[PDB]
Each structure stands twice: as C-alpha cells, then as structure tokens.
Structure 1
Amino acid sequence: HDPLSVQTGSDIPASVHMPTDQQRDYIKREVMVPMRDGVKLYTVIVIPKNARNAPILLTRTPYNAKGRANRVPNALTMREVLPQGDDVFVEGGYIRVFQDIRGKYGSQGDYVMTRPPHGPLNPTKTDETTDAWDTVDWLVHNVPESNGRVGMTGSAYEGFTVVMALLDPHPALKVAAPESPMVDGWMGDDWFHYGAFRQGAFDYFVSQMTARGGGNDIPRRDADDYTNFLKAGSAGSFATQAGLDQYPFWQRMHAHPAYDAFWQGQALDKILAQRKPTVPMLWEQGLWDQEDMWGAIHAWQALKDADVKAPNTLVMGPWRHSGVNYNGSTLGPLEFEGDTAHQYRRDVFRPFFDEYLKPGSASVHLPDAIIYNTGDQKWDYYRSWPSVCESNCTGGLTPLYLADGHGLSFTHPAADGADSYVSDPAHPVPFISRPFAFAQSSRWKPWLVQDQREAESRPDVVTYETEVLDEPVRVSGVPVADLFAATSGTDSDWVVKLIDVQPAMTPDDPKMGGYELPVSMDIFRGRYRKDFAKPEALQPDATLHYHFTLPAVNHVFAKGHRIMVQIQSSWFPLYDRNPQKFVPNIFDAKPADYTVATQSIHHGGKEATSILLPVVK
C-alpha cells in the first residue's frame, strides 16, 4: 500500500530531531548528577554557543528545573529560555544551571520540606549543604566550557538552598546572592510571624508534597477563603478536612506550634552566624516582601554582629516577594522611578558577581546596605546601616507616642489614658478586602501596599494619626512596636501598622488622596510575650508590655502627609484567629474556645504605647 495515502501505523514519529536546535544560540544539557550517597539529581545546564571559560550561575530548586530553564519552552534564544531575572547574566555570557533538589521532579531521593542541616533534626550523611557541595564539585570537573567558577543565587526556596550552601561551601563557590530566602519560618518567614500561623501554607503543603512532581491545591467549597476558613473554624480543622493529617510535615508542624527545638534548630540566621562564612554575599529582599520579610535582613544583621570578614551587603528595593527578578517600576497603585529591579540587577548584582566569577573584572566596593527610599524615590547608599537602633548604634530610636484624641506625638504625653476596641472572632478583620482566595495571586502579591481605610472604618480597629505634616520626617532602619495593651481574655494577637497617609488630595493622581499606605506592619501572638518557646496565658484586663521589631523602613513622610498607626487583633484569613482564650494548641481550638474580648491600648504615662521610629536627619 502507498504510505503517502494509506497509514496503517502511527502518525507520531518514533524519534524527533528538529532543525530548530541548530537555530539556537545556546546548548542545553540534561544530566543526573550523583551525590555522595548515590542519589542522582536532575541538572539542566544552559550553555551559550561558543562559550569558553564562562562563569556558572547556579540555582537549586523544588520548582521543576526543566520548567525554570524553559520560560519560553524550547526558545530559539537563551534570553527567552531563561527567566527575566537572568537577563543580565545572559547578556554577560554566563552558563546557567538549574537543578531539582533531592526528592523533587526529575531528582531521586526522599523529599523533606526545608530539609534541616546536619544535626539533631537530620542525623543522615546528607543535607542541602552537601548536595550543593557535590553539585558544584561535579560542575567544575564536567563542564569544559566553564572557567571552574560558580556563583549561587535564587529567591525564596531557591534562596534557602543558597543559604544552606553557605554553611559549608565548595571552594569553587566564589559568590552568593540569596534573594528573599526562607531563613526562619517561625519568627517571620513563611509559616508563622511571631507565632501567628499563616493559613496559605496549607495549599503549599498539598501542592509541593503530594507527589515527587506536580501537585494540586486543596479543593474549595466557597470562592472566598475568608468564608472557607471561618466556616471550618480552627486551622487544624481546615487541615483535617483537607486531608493534611496524613502529610508528615504538617504532622511535625502541628506538634510544634511554639518556638521549640524543632524551629530553633532550623533558624538559619543563627546557624550561619556561628559558621561565619567567608564567601562574598549579597542579601536581598523586598521592602514589601509578603512571604519572606524576616530572612535576608536578619541573616545579614547576624553576620554583621558576628564580624564576618567578607563582603556582606543588604539590598532592599520597593518590591513584593521575589520582585527583584521581574519589573520593579510599580507595586499596586505605587509608581517608582524606573525599573528598580532591573536597575539593581544591572548596576549592583551583575558587577558584584563579575568581580569574583570573571577574572580581570573591575572591583566593586559596596556599602553596608543599598536601600530604595520610598519617600525620596531614589537609591540610598549607606556605608554604615542602620545609623539608629536600640543597641550598639550611633544613635537611638525616636518614639512616636499614641496620644489623646487618637493622635500621635513625638512629645511624651504626661496624661494617662486608654482606647478600647472589641475583638470578635466571629467577625475577624479581613487582611485585604473580601472576597479573597489564596489562589488569587494577583491580589496576594501586592497586598502589603493596599489602602488601610477599610480597617480604619471598623470598630474593632483603633487608629491614631499625627496632624498634617509641616516638615518632612525621615526614617531609616527598623521600627519597634512598644505596645502596652490589655485584653479581657487570656490570649490575643496584636497587629501593629505604621502608615503613611497621603495628602488629603493628590490632584495629579486623584485616587491616592488620603490613601493609607502601610510602610511597615506585623502581628504578634500574645501568648509568646515572655518566651517564644514557652507560651503563657495573659492576665485578663492587665496592661501588658509587648516589644517587637517591625519590617524595616527607608521612607520620608513628606509635607502634607500624616504618620498613622493602626492596631487590631485579627488579620483574616491570612492568619488563623486567636481564640482569645488560652488553649494549649491554637491549631486545635474548638468552637467554644473563641471568645469575644475587649482590648485596651494605653497611651501616655509609664505605659506610653509608641512606635520606636528610626528617625534620621
């Protein structure tokens, strides 16, 4: 029979060898790199055509290396095939490497969520540190087009693997750039913020741990997660209905609600500081990092306190989580001066890496910190940062006290007073307007810059503000909440927001008129007031002292603006509700545990609530 007319076989070719591969400006190599224990990791190596003695940029990920190196699947150019954040390195003729971490996608082995370093939580012979070590060693001995020099980078979990590598790096690892890294999931990164549980973790658990490869989110009943979580009750109740009780990582998390040995043995900022790395580091996070706000700044500061003898620079731009690898010209309704993300990548990131990865390159002398000013709209270069803080700094912090008539003053109010608000767990304050589902990435990403006017309009939120500013107030450093608060219950969460109120009218951009822009906010779970590792019941109606750091600022409250402070006791559904009655484990709270409570914030006198502001000249 004529094959050009009659097909009795298959129309699917046995093997494909398309000439589009010869039309590429790069070469893609797939290799199973063996670790010291025999476990092989899937590694993608993207080499520019005619590359000779080129440096290597490495990233280790739980997010499918094959896909990460395929922004535009099988693209004709390296620029399209690699992520937007790799732009400056593609332009620099770097060799790009993406590797699936142990137990994920193309890699063999067992997967352990944020696998702990060797120690009491990991008694085996391998960890993310040795895996990175073995990887770098293989690369410098099996990539002839390379110069044997490796640089490491990555954001979030991809930043976590960089930090792990820094614990004991291979001699060929010449430079590192952890971006929004997961450093302490309990203190202020992905899982908790000062012990307050982040409910978006459930979808992440099922999505990343259902299979070696891809997984799905938890099927929902309602389009609104405010509804879904409130109806389920406690976080543990939602997890149980989702089937998470059979997931080993959730089993461990549920067993360790407090900051005990399980979480302390995973605090990478403290562990890295003990090791005192000698590899040049560039730490980065967004000023509005909605997923890993604790990581970079705390790791960088710990290293500074440990007196590291290696380049250790902190970079913070006007970005959301991982925004550094995309376009940084805007965030929500905010507009910045140009693509700040590309600016950093091109003017700082790239030259810094070139110095150690490309022999003969110009030397860069980076300061302590490079931070974008969200007030002046420009990049600030700080030789020594911060210049103001609570201890061991040139100057101290400047308290902005809460006052009578819901005001704020830099003068300590002698008059004693208190403002009350009722916190009702049956009607928790939406962290962003309803309806909201964790699946709505477009709403989640810029949530930290949203207008706080909705919250202000509620009786379960207390708001304070200065008079309209006649002179600008410059802040640069870490604000500290010095809170004196009472609750009629035996437990409570305390949400503190530092806000920049835009001019009453903004005629050049009308929508921004009176807009309440939060520059720094966080939540503190009251039971941990005395000890993060040992939760304790609060005394009903007792004015108690809470003292905790808030996200860093580098802002200028300009003329016409106001400084504002908002305090509330819920932030739903991002954070699970504090039942306001002391229970052993808030994950297991029952319907009858949730108690309406009256909260009282004291102002003036010996218990003068204030925000310790890093005011500078």
Structure 2
Amino acid sequence: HDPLSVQTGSDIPQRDYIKREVMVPMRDGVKLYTVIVIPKNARNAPILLTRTPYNAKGRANRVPNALTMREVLPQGDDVFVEGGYIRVFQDIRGKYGSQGDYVMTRPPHGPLNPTKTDETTDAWDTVDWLVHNVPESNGRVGMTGSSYEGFTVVMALLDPHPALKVAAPESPMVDGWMGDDWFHYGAFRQGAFDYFVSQMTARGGGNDIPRRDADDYTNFLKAGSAGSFATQAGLDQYPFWQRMHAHPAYDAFWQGQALDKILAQRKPTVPMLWEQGLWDQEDMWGAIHAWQALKDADVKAPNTLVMGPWRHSGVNYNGSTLGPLEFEGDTAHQYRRDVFRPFFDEYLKPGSASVHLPDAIIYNTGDQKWDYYRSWPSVCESNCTGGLTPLYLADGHGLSFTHPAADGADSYVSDPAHPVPFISRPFAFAQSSRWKPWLVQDQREAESRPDVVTYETEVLDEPVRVSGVPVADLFAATSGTDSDWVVKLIDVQPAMTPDDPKMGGYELPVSMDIFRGRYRKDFAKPEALQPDATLHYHFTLPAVNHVFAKGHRIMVQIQSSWFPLYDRNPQKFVPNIFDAKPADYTVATQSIHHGGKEATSILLPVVK
C-alpha cells in the first residue's frame, strides 16, 4: 500500500531564547516544577524569580511558544527582557506540575506549621539550586511577584538565601483578616468562595462555582448567610474553608499569619521595594503595613514604598487609565523603567549605577504627577512632623474644618433585605472587567438612597492637599446589637467638566473601607453592641496622595452594607455571622452623631 495515498495508521506523529523545564528538589525530596527562560547568548545574566500558584508553564507562555522572549513573558517583564535578565517561574508546592501537599497561604514554621518545610525553605532551596545549576547566570537572584506571587516573596524574606540580593513584593497577601483578601476589619469578602474552588479543587486548574442567577446580588441574597452559600456550593468538604469558618475573629489562627508583624521581628537586610495600587481592590493592607512595620523596626536596608494610580496588580500592565480616569502616561511602565529596573540592576548587575530612593514614591491623583517623598508620611496620629486635621460632620449635611460646638445626629434605616450594592447591579464575581476598577466608580447611586447618609463641603475656593492615611473617627449608634460601618472619603468633581462632560459632579472615592462593629474593642474578642448607645469607632482608611482642587468638594458617605462583596451583618449579635439564620437578620435605625464631645470626623492627613 502506497503511504502517500493510503493511511492505515495515525496522522498524529528561530527563537531568541531557550526554555528549560526542571524538577528542583526541596530539602524533603518534594520536587517543584520550574521553568527557566534564558536569552540566547546570555552570559553572567541576573535571575528574576517568581514562585506562583497560577501555573508556571502558562505564566512563561503569554504568547504560547513564541519566537521572541518579549512575547513569551508577561507585559510586566518588559524592562527585564530588555535588560537581558534570565526569568524563572516556579510552581509552588502542591500546584500544577509540582509535587507535595498544597496548603492555602501556607503558614510559616511555628504553631500553625510544625513540619520541616514552608514557603521560606522552598524559596531557599530554589535559589540555592539556581545559583549552582544555571551557568548562564551571575548567581545573583531578585524576587518579585504580585498578589499570591508577592506573598511568596515576603515568605522568602523571612529567611533569605544569601544569593537573594533584592526583593519587590507587589500587592502582596500579608494579613488576610485585617484588610487583604478574606476579611476587611472582620467583614467577610464573598468573592473568596470562587477563589477557593478554583485553586483547591485540584492540583491543576479548577472551575468556578455554578450559578443560578447571572447577578450575584441575587445569588447571595437568596442563599442568605455566607455559610449557607458555601454549603450549597459544596465547600464544607474543603479543609481551608473549615478552618476559616471556625475562626471568624482575629484569634491565634490569623495572628500567626500576620506577615507584617513577623517580618518586622526578623528584620531583613535585603533591599526592598514595596508596591501597591492606590485603588488596589484585593490587597490594600499588605505592602503599606509591611513597609511601615519595617520602617518602625528601623530596618537596616533600603525600604521604599511605591504607590501608583492602579488597581490590584496594575503595576504589571498599562497604568494610563483606570475606569473612566485618565493619568499622565503609562504610569506602570514609568515605574517599571525608572524605579524598578534601575533598583534591581544596582544589586543584580555589579557595576550598575547606584540609586538613592526616598521613603516613598507616590503618584499624586490631584496634581497628576509622581511625588518623591524623602520622609513619609509627614503627618499622622503620633510620632510625626505634624498631626491629622479633622474634617467634621455638621448640620445640613455639611463638612467643616471647624469643630461644631452643638450636638446633633442624622439617622438612616439599614435593612438587610435591601442591602446597598457595592457597584451597580447586576454584578457577578466572574466579571473581571467590572471588578478590577470598582473602587473608582461614581458613588452617586449610593447618595440617592435613604439607607446612606452623605455630607459635603461647600465648593472649594482653595485646594486642600492630603498625603498620608486618613482615619475615621466615628461616633455612631445602632438600634440593633451588631452593625457594619462603611465610610467613604470622596472627591466630588466640578459640577460641570466641559472637556469631559460625563465627569461633571462625579463622586470619586479616593479612600473607603468597612468596619465590623462587633470588633470595636478587640479584634480577637467579639462583643455585642449596646442598642441606642452612641459608640466610638476609630480605624484607618486606605492611603491618599491627592489634591481636592478649586471647584471640587470633599464628601463623606456612611452606610451599613456593601453587597455582595461583603456579607450582610445581621444587625443582631450572633456567635458566628457565617451561620446566621433567616430570622436573625434585623432591620435597624443607625444614627451618626456630629458636634460636641462625640463629633464624628475624618482625620485627614492635610499637608501644606
């Protein structure tokens, strides 16, 4: 039979870089899948390493099997591809092509991890193997990564290999209870469920949770409590959910995973560049708190904080815009080329010029430029050059820098059957395009509701500059025995913006957060609220570096639900909110006090 005409068998049988796939053994014999991308004719090149739970093979295949290194590696690696670096992506223990048991945000060695290995030792063994088994490299390794990839960098900094010469944790997962991915001051973030099934259903890729309605406001409201939704989704068989469910409060389980505290105790000497977006919608707490903790522990190494006009992980893509907002050029690329690259070159490419970075490099969302701050912040509640400036709530739904002498209060009814949408309906957690820029969305929809109270200054005659961390000084009462308190600090654009009409009167949030009331006194010991008693809440809000220009107004909005992002507070003290029952959800009248000795205000970091 002619083989060029009859087939009785089966028809199934130029690059500027080389890719190597290796199984790196750890101290305990578990081998991790590691991909190494090396430029052709690379010699004595530094190594840029990232450890990830998101498929190393795919991470190094942006354009699958491309002909150029620039195409095969992520957009964020553009400056390093141009600099001639070797790039390494590795699958963390128990994910994709790596062996071992996978533990979600594996705790460091201690009470929560008595084994002989963790993410610090895995990073250690990885760097050791690289400097002894990659001849094209100069033996100098730099670590970087965003989100969970940033968590792995922080974990390496607990006990770094001597060949790790510099680190750049980006929007890292530091404290998941205080203000990163799982909770914000005790208030649970319901998007976590899809993340758990997606990352822990299998070693490799997993799926999302099938939905009934296209709108998650409907899906979660019909299921009732968060635990009820988890049970219906089959999450009760997932070990990490069983632990989280059992630890709703900031007890030993969470305290033992607060990497900002742990890192400050270790005091690393590896140069660090901490980064996060001003509108980071997934890990807002991480970088800034780690950087501040190190700064307070008087760390003996470069320790610079960088904050750009970006959403979560935005630093690795185009930072020219965010939602309807426009910035001065590709701010992400600007940072990667002018700060990130030169800083990494100093420690990874001997003979490279030295850079002297200040305490903080922060984009100014008002002036539309990069600010270099030698010492930062210049104002705060204690041990700073200056103090905070209270912007008090007042009568007539006003805001004034003058303390109102007389007492007063404004009330609103919070009904858990009609919770305030965090963004316009309909929304599903799968809708990435609407999730990413959510923090910069107009708050006018919220202003129009009777379950949201809004205060604003007169139109500004002179600009007010703010740079630092604002603090909510709230004096509020609830008729119930529990409640959540959402406080938003907003820049109201000029009534009319003729050069871009859609922005006229736009209520742009510059900083907002939620606080779960049962933790007012102690995050580790929840207690019921006293009904109808005005109580004092004091908590830090996301950092600002902004200017409220002439023609704008400063606005503050307060409400008691933010759904479906945050589960509903039943407004009745129950042992565990995850297990709240239908009958537990109670309507309550909330009252915000202003003036006198209970003068609610936002402590603003005003600067000259």
Measured in 2, the distance between the counterparts of 1:182 and 1:477 equals 21
Output the CA distance in 1 between the equivalents of 2:43 and 2:320. 35
Cα separation, 1, equivalents of 2:574 and 2:287: 33
Q: Secondary structure at the match of 2:586?
A: coil
- Distance in 1 between residues matched to 2:276 and 2:604, nearest whole Å: 21
Q: Offset at 1:254?
A: 0.1
Q: Deviations over 1:219-272 (max 9, x none)?
A: 000000000000000000000000000000000000000000000000000000
Give how far 1:450 is off.
Answer: 0.1
Give, in angstroms, the shift of residue 500 of structure 1: 0.1
How far is 1:73 from its partner?
0.2
Q: Normalising by structure 2, what TM-score? A: 1.00
Q: String of CA shifts for 1:581-609, please: whole Å, max 9, x gaps.
A: 00000000000000000000000000000
1:472 to 446, 463, 473: 463
Aligned to 1:277: 268
Report the alpha carbon displacement of residue 561 of structure 1 after superposing the two structures with TM: 0.1
The separation in 2 between residues aligned to 1:243 and 1:448, in whole angstroms, is 31
Cα distance, 1:50 vs structure 2: 0.1
Q: Residue 15 of structure 1 aligns with which residue? A: none
Matched, 1:116 2:100: no
Secondary structure of the structure 1 residue equivalent to 2:276: strand
Q: Secondary structure at the match of 1:500?
A: strand
Partner of 1:502: 493
- 1:190 counterpart residue number: 181
1:350-397 CA deviation, whole Å, 9 max, x = no partner? 000000000000000000000000000000000000000001000000
Name the CA distance, whole Å, in 1 between partners of 2:97 and 2:421.
Answer: 40
SS at match of 2:244: helix
2:211 and 2:230 map into 1 onto residues whose CA distance is 12
CA distance in 1, matches of 2:3, 2:367: 72
Q: Secondary structure, in 3 states, of the residue corresponding to 1:514?
A: coil
Structure 2 distance, partners of 1:487, 1:80, is: 56
The 2-side partners of 1:167 and 1:487 are apart by 43
Does residue 1:314 correspond to 2:302, yes or no?
Answer: no
Partner SS state of residue 299, structure 2 = coil
Q: Which residue of 2 aligns with 1:435?
A: 426
- Alpha-carbon distance in structure 1 between the residues aligned to 2:598 and 2:259: 35
For 1:139 and 1:282, locate their aligned partners in 2 and report how far apart those are by CA, in whole Å. Answer: 23
How far did 1:38 drift? 0.0
Alignment partner for residue 551 of structure 2, among 560, 566, 576? 560
Cα drift, residue 472 of structure 1: 0.1
- Cα deviation for residue 202 of structure 1 reads 0.1
Find the counterpart in structure 2 of residue 222 from structure 1.
Answer: 213
SS of the counterpart of 1:230?
helix
The CA deviation at 1:415 is 1.2
Matched, 1:8 2:8: yes
SS of residue in 2 equivalent to 1:321: coil
State the Cα deviation string for residues 407-445 of structure 1 (Å, max 9, x = none). Answer: 000000001100000000000000000000000000000
Q: In the aligned structure 2, how far is the partner of 1:492 from the partner of 1:564?
A: 22
- The structural deviation recorded for 1:126 is 0.1
In the TM superposition, residue 205 of structure 1 has moved relative to its aligned partner by 0.2
Q: Distance in 1 between matches of 2:67 and 2:483?
A: 56
Indicate the residue corresponding to 1:351 in structure 2. Answer: 342
SS of the residue corresponding to residue 455 of structure 1 reads helix
Aligned counterparts of 1:400 and 1:505: Cα–Cα separation in 2: 25
**Aligned-partner Cα distance in 2 for 1:460–1:67:** 46
Shift of 1:277: 0.4
1:83, 1:584 → 2: CA distance?
Answer: 46
Q: Distance in 1 between matches of 2:567 and 2:63?
A: 38
Residues of 2 paired with 1:522 and 1:3: CA distance?
71
Instruction: Show the counterpart of 2:536.
Output: 545
Q: Distance in 1 between matches of 2:304 and 2:595?
A: 39
What SS does structure 1 have at the residue aligned with 2:459? coil
| Secondary structure of the structure 2 residue equivalent to 1:524 | strand
Report the alpha carbon displacement of residue 24 of structure 1 after superposing the two structures with TM: 0.1
Q: Deviations over 1:164-188 (max 9, x none)?
A: 0000000000000000000000000
Secondary structure of 1:401's counterpart equals strand
2:40 equivalent in structure 1: 49
Aligned partner of residue 33 in structure 1, secondary structure: strand
Q: Percent identity over the alignment?
A: 100
Q: Give the Cα–Cα distance (whole angstroms) in 1 for the partners of residues 540 and 144 of structure 2.
A: 27
Q: Tell me the distance in 1 between the aligned counterparts of 2:241 and 2:117.
A: 23
Q: Take 1:603 and 1:71, find their aligned partners in 2: how far apart are those partners?
A: 54
CA distance in structure 2 between the aligned counterparts of 1:4 and 1:121, rounded to whole angstroms: 65
What is the aligned partner in structure 2 of residue 299 from structure 1? 290
Deviations 1:73-101 (A, max 9, x none): 00000000000000000000000000000
Q: Which residue of 2 aligns with 1:237?
A: 228
- Partner residue in 2 for 1:69: 60
1:482, 1:413 → 2: CA distance?
Answer: 15
**Equivalent residue for 2:396?**
405
Aligned-pair distance for 1:535?
0.2
State the Cα distance separating 1:189 from its structure 2 match: 0.0
Following superposition, the deviation at residue 198 of structure 1 comes to 0.1
Distance in 2 (CA, whole Å) between partners of 1:125 and 1:586 is: 36
| Distance (Å, rounded) in 1 between the aligned partners of 2:385 and 2:120 | 37
Q: 1:156 offset after TM fit, Å?
A: 0.1
**Helix, strand or coil: the match of 1:251?**
helix
Q: Deviations over 1:193-213 (max 9, x none)?
A: 000000000000000000000
Q: CA deviation at 1:406?
A: 0.1
SS state of the match for residue 72, structure 1? coil
Partner of 2:473, secondary structure, is strand
The secondary structure found in structure 2 opposite 1:125 is coil
2:480 maps to 1:489: yes
Q: Distance in 1 between matches of 2:528 and 2:105?
A: 31
CA distance, structure 2, for counterparts of residue 425 and residue 551 of structure 1: 26
- Runs of 4+ in structure 1 deviating by more than 2 angstroms, as ranges, are none
- 1:177 match: secondary structure: strand
Secondary structure in 1 matching 2:128: helix
- Separation in 2, partners of 1:94, 1:451: 42
Task: Kindly provide the CA deviation profile for residues 22-61 of structure 1, in whole angstroms up to 9, marking residues without a partner as x.
Answer: x000000000000000000000000000000000000000
Partner secondary structure for residue 334 of structure 2: helix
CA offsets, 1:561-585, max 9 Å, x none?
Answer: 0000000000000000000000000
Structure 2 stretches lacking a partner, 5+ long: none
Residue 525 of structure 1: CA displacement? 0.1
- Secondary structure in 1 aligned to 2:343? helix
Q: Distance in 2 between matches of 1:330 and 1:416?
A: 43
Q: Does 2:252 match 1:258? A: no
SS in 2 for 1:496: strand
Task: Tell me, in whole angstroms, the C-alpha distance in 2 between the residues paired with 1:3 and 1:612.
Answer: 82
Shift of 1:306: 0.2
CA deviation digits over 1:273-313, x for unaligned, max 9? Answer: 00000000000000000000000000000000000010000
